[PDB]
Amino acid sequence: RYRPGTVALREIRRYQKSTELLIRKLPFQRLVREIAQDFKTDLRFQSSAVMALQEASEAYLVGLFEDTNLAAIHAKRVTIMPKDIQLARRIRGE
């Protein structure tokens, strides 16, 4: 049994070496179609549009998690917390 953190580094290396999408195709598509239901009813989506939305969302989330990890390390911690996310979003401009 690996100690807590040994497999975390392996996962970090595996998911930084790779380049595939991390969120599943169908749940994200349903989320996008549900979010777009408050702006225009009976709205159709292109496949490339949903793919582009998924790439943009995952890139934004990865950048946000990088900033959140930077903030958490700044506070003498390795565990990222919602306060780190809030600080990163405030400093960034959101």
Binding site: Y15, F28, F65
Partner: protein, 81 residues
Amino acid sequence: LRDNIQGITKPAIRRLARRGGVKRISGLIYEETRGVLKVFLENVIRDAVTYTEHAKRKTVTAMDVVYALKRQGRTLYGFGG
């Protein structure tokens, strides 16, 4: 479509954070991150829909999403040009 935000599962958030270089994760950052993610989408999709509604179209093309992302200072290369 009802309550599809919970489709962004805990393992998906964990994988996204692992790609971001995060070693340990607090249990309360999932329900937070999802919200943040939704907010991001609630912006981009909105602009995309507007770009569609100006063109008298129904299908949200990939170029609408590309222009919406370019509006917010996040250019996306590879889709539609």
